[PDB]
Amino acid sequence: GPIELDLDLIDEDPHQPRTADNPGFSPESIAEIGATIKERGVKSPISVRENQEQPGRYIINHGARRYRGSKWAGKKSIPAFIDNDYNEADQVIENLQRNELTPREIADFIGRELAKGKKKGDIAKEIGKSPAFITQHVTLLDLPEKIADAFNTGRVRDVTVVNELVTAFKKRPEEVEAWLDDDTQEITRGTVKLLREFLDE
Amino acid sequence: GPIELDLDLIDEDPHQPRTADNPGFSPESIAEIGATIKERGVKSPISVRENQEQPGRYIINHGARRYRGSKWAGKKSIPAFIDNDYNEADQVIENLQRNELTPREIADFIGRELAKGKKKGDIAKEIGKSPAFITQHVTLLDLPEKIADAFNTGRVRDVTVVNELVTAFKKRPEEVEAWLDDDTQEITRGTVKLLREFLDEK
Ligand SMILES: Nc1ccn([C@@H]2O[C@H](COP(=O)(O)OP(=O)(O)OP(=O)(O)O)[C@@H](O)[C@H]2O)c(=O)n1
Numbered sequence: 001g002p003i004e005l006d007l008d009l010i011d012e013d014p015h016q017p018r019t020a021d022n023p024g025f026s027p028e029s030i031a032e033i034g035a036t037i038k039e040r041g042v043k044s045p046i047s048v049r050e051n052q053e054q055p056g057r058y059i060i061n062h063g064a065r066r067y068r069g070s071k072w073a074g075k076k077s078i079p080a081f082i083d084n085d086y087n088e089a090d091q092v093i094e095n096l097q098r099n100e101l102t103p104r105e106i107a108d109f110i111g112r113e114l115a116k117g118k119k120k121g122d123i124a125k126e127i128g129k130s131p132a133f134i135t136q137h138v139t140l141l142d143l144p145e146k147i148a149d150a151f152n153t154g155r156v157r158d159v160t161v162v163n164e165l166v167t168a169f170k171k172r173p174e175e176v177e178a179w180l181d182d183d184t185q186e187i188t189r190g191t192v193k194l195l196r197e198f199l200d201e
Numbered sequence: 202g203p204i205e206l207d208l209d210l211i212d213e214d215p216h217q218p219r220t221a222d223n224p225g226f227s228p229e230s231i232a233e234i235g236a237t238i239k240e241r242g243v244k245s246p247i248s249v250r251e252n253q254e255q256p257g258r259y260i261i262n263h264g265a266r267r268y269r270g271s272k273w274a275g276k277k278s279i280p281a282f283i284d285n286d287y288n289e290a291d292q293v294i295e296n297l298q299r300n301e302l303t304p305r306e307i308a309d310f311i312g313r314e315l316a317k318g319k320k321k322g323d324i325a326k327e328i329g330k331s332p333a334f335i336t337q338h339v340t341l342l343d344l345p346e347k348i349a350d351a352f353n354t355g356r357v358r359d360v361t362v363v364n365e366l367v368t369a370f371k372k373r374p375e376e377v378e379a380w381l382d383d384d385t386q387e388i389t390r391g392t393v394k395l396l397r398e399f400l401d402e403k
Pocket residue numbers: 093094095097098099100217219225234237238241242243244245246262263264265266267268296
């Protein structure tokens with residue numbers, strides 16, 4: 001098993017590669033992971049090494065956000081394992097060697113929850129995200145036909161841009177379809193911003 | 202500690218939110234995490250639950266890439282903990298509730314390694330990335346002045362775009378400086394592509 005370690009006994013590593021400026025150490029970001037820890041617990045135990053200088057204490061290998069989130073959530077302890085064979089490169093590995101769910105995969109998860117009758121509000125809570133994040137992904141579950149093609153072929157991949165394109169389609173469907181019908185037309189945050197403006201003239 | 206669990210006792214969860222199409226299940230991606238596992242081990246133990254249907258066996262809560270990477274690396278076992286109180290939402294949490302190092306933070310780590318005399322090739326290996334990835338970040342350690350400002354103020358944040366902007370600066374420094382001196386000028390993959398082309402005519 002993992003050990004439940006008193007937070008009082010744990011120090012952050014001052015040479016960790018994540019610096020103070022990192023978005024992930026913003027109060028909002030710690031609050032976000034913190035809420036999931038309050039609800040579900042830390043699900044991936046942190047890695048610590050024994051402090052050689054102060055026996056009985058531990059230094060974080062990986063897990064500073066889980067640690068700060070645990071404090072935010074009012075936890076007295078955190079699940080952890082001891083690994084004294086952990087180096088600075090491993091800390092960068094922990095962070096770089098991982099891959100996200102796609103927007104489609106997130107939408108489809110939301111879809112399966114909606115199909116079971118769960119409210120958007122509760123779907124937000126159980127994954128620790130905002131209602132606006134749910135809304136943006138839900139858009140992908142019922143895309144207009146031409147926009148769906150562009151999304152599936154990979155001609156546009158960013159959920160925010162897809163949403164902006166749908167919002168335009170609702171107000172002016174013929175004009176957006178003719179813009180997509182051009183093969184030279186790339187789809188970026190920028191080109192869509194240009195399309196929105198063209199349509200308000 | 203974590204248990205070293207026989208890979209033969211572990212099955213993937215067929216309702217995991219990562220699907221077959223996901224870039225992270227590509228052979229190249231499994232090879233990438235696999236190399237780090239071959240060298241360093243799995244450093245974050247996977248989470249499994251007991252299979253109720255098949256006693257003695259386990260289903261993956263989180264850890265399918267670590268699992269496949271372990272197989273790629275020729276491992277017979279994988280570090281794991283048992284959590285029988287794990288649901289489908291937790292699987293999406295494991296993945297969405299995490300934040301990257303910035304490009305600056307990655308460059309500066311590389312910087313610290315270079316300053317100790319480590320070669321680029323060994324820095325690539327120890328973080329499981331390609332030489333080209335190292336190169337693109339190393340660019341950030343010696344940015345021309347005006348590009349540095351734009352990078353630091355957040356006017357451009359993407360490492361790829363910064364590299365493209367440096368490469369343009371090398372060939373036409375006066376013209377790139379005057380392009381950055383315009384406040385209306387946004388800096389995107391697109392605008393820089395437009396700048397590259399404008400310069401290849403003159
Ligand atoms: N030698 C390594 C390299 C990476 N990792 C960890 O492996 C995880 C990979 O995350 P992800 O890409 O999301 O894949 P898995 O969670 O393993 O698989 P899945 O999300 O499909 O369940 C990260 O926590 C990373 O720190 C590790 O434990 N040891």
